[PDB]
Amino acid sequence: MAMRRANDPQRREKIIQATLEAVKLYGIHAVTHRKIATLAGVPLGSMTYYFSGIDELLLEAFSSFTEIMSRQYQAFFSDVSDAPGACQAITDMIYSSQVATPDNMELMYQLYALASRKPLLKTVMQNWMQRSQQTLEQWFEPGTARALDAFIEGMTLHFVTDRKPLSREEILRMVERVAG
Amino acid sequence: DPQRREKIIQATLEAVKLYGIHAVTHRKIATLAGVPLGSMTYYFSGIDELLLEAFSSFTEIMSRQYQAFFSDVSDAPGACQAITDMIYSSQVATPDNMELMYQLYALASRKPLLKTVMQNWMQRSQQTLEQWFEPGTARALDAFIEGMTLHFVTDRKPLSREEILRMVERVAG
């Protein structure tokens, strides 16, 4: 019954992309095998034999999403070779508004919303934090690294939200305060 | 009566947690409130205005909680301890609060009225912080609180209270 399943990579990848698509269309609370399968263009009967339940599918789909986010994250530090340059890169990450996009926000904050109800989704967030931490720890002590990532978490959102957000100058100064 | 209106506001928040913002309808809210469907029409016009009112009610409770952490604060060092307490207490980033707050955040870009709720909410927090901090520093602290409240309850190995304090003091300048 482990050997009943076939694990097709084409079907799998379609189901994963349709899952993210379903989250956008319906909200994370409302996604189901049925909705996903319809978006995916696969038989509903198929779904059970790739992912046992909705949480495991959600896990795979969001893991795909945070993988992409982490590549973008690391890419901001491509030219960093000291602490002040690291601070500049973090300022870029916040000021560029390329992380906190409408599309990215819609997906990540739905992940965050449901993660206290769904342990697999909390695991996704925990893995994602650890990757960001490991990136920052190239240039910062672990406590400072965690402080910066929390600052980035908050400031990327607030920057695109506030009626009157901070200047890049203000952002760089605050980042430099946190770096110590 | 106002008691029925409040039941409807509360059921809207309950419905957001059960169905997601996208799937919330007047009818789903009325059943959770346990009120006749006709009451939905009496008290509220659109589903978007109801969502606005319900989330506004939620952020007003959050702000009441936010201000309460500073009840014993008379200066900036004290404010740093209060902020550290707010984070370390995990009382802000509770499962219920997170499920409501992050759904609001999720849909803000698609729903202008909700974005207004978020902006109103961060202005109140800033106003609280600006009692002891410069406006720029107040915004930095509120963003740091936004991130660290969440990270503290999520991290497999979060920061200790003393570490949080030191970082709050760093941001405070």
Side-chain angles (χ1 to χ4, degrees):
Chain A
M1 135 187 294
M3 302 193 180
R4 286 179 190 178
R5 129 179 161 278
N7 276 357
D8 194 275
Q10 168 176 123
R11 234 182 243 163
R12 174 158 296 252
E13 185 51 37
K14 274 208 295 187
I15 293 174
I16 285 169
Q17 294 306 314
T19 300
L20 291 179
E21 180 181 355
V23 176
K24 298 188 186 86
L25 286 198
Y26 297 102
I28 193 179
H29 289 74
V31 298
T32 62
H33 275 352
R34 191 179 295 274
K35 269 161 186 164
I36 292 171
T38 300
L39 293 177
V42 293
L44 178 50
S46 155
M47 294 291 281
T48 322
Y49 297 76
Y50 287 94
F51 312 90
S52 302
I54 188 63
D55 289 347
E56 286 180 13
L57 188 30
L58 286 181
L59 158 68
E60 295 300 321
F62 277 101
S63 295
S64 171
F65 164 76
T66 69
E67 279 307 329
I68 296 171
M69 294 291 282
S70 291
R71 295 212 137 232
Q72 175 189 33
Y73 193 100
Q74 184 78 48
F76 283 102
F77 301 87
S78 305
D79 299 306
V80 171
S81 59
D82 61 2
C87 291
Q88 284 292 352
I90 293 170
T91 302
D92 290 341
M93 179 183 308
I94 296 163
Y95 199 68
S96 65
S97 308
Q98 294 169 2
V99 177
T101 70
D103 284 330
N104 284 346
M105 289 196 289
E106 195 174 17
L107 283 177
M108 62 190 285
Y109 293 135
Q110 291 205 80
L111 169 65
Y112 290 7
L114 207 46
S116 76
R117 316 303 183 187
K118 295 180 174 299
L120 287 184
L121 296 190
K122 185 169 171 181
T123 294
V124 177
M125 297 179 55
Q126 287 176 325
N127 291 340
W128 193 10
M129 294 178 55
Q130 294 211 231
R131 293 200 298 271
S132 300
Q133 283 164 23
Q134 203 164 320
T135 294
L136 294 176
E137 285 173 4
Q138 300 173 254
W139 302 288
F140 301 102
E141 301 170 351
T144 301
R146 277 165 163 88
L148 289 165
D149 193 44
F151 185 71
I152 292 161
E153 185 80 64
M155 190 53 75
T156 53
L157 170 67
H158 285 191
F159 179 66
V160 301
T161 304
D162 205 323
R163 286 184 177 104
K164 55 203 181 199
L166 300 172
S167 62
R168 186 188 193 281
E169 305 98 295
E170 291 175 285
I171 294 165
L172 177 65
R173 275 208 68 234
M174 299 303 169
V175 170
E176 283 179 341
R177 291 190 181 169
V178 179
Chain B
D1 57 334
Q3 283 50 65
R4 176 158 283 181
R5 184 189 185 279
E6 187 51 34
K7 287 180 57 171
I8 288 169
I9 293 290
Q10 291 307 299
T12 300
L13 298 178
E14 185 184 2
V16 163
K17 290 182 307 192
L18 175 64
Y19 299 109
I21 295 189
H22 302 77
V24 163
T25 63
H26 281 103
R27 197 204 284 150
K28 286 175 187 163
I29 295 175
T31 82
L32 285 174
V35 300
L37 189 53
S39 285
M40 300 306 297
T41 291
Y42 181 93
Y43 290 108
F44 302 101
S45 170
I47 198 61
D48 279 321
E49 179 178 47
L50 182 42
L51 282 176
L52 161 74
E53 282 293 329
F55 275 114
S56 286
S57 181
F58 162 72
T59 68
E60 279 155 23
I61 291 175
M62 294 294 284
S63 285
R64 206 144 58 221
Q65 178 185 42
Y66 195 95
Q67 189 73 52
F69 274 101
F70 297 91
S71 61
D72 286 343
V73 177
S74 51
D75 52 33
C80 290
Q81 295 279 353
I83 290 168
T84 302
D85 290 337
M86 188 190 297
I87 295 168
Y88 197 66
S89 77
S90 319
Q91 290 315 102
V92 178
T94 65
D96 282 351
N97 289 350
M98 287 191 292
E99 189 162 19
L100 287 172
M101 139 176 35
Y102 296 130
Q103 286 199 66
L104 173 72
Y105 295 0
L107 277 87
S109 60
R110 323 294 187 194
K111 286 185 181 291
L113 262 53
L114 294 188
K115 194 185 182 179
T116 286
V117 172
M118 285 176 66
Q119 296 174 316
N120 292 350
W121 186 12
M122 50 199 302
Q123 284 172 208
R124 291 197 302 270
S125 299
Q126 297 164 12
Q127 192 178 332
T128 295
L129 286 179
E130 278 171 21
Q131 301 175 262
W132 308 282
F133 301 108
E134 183 263 330
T137 298
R139 278 174 168 83
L141 284 168
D142 191 48
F144 182 77
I145 291 169
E146 185 82 66
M148 190 56 80
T149 52
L150 172 62
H151 284 193
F152 179 75
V153 304
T154 306
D155 205 322
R156 294 182 172 117
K157 193 184 74 181
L159 294 186
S160 67
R161 186 191 186 279
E162 57 183 322
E163 291 181 298
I164 298 166
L165 176 58
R166 172 207 324 306
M167 302 302 173
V168 174
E169 287 183 319
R170 283 194 194 166
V171 176

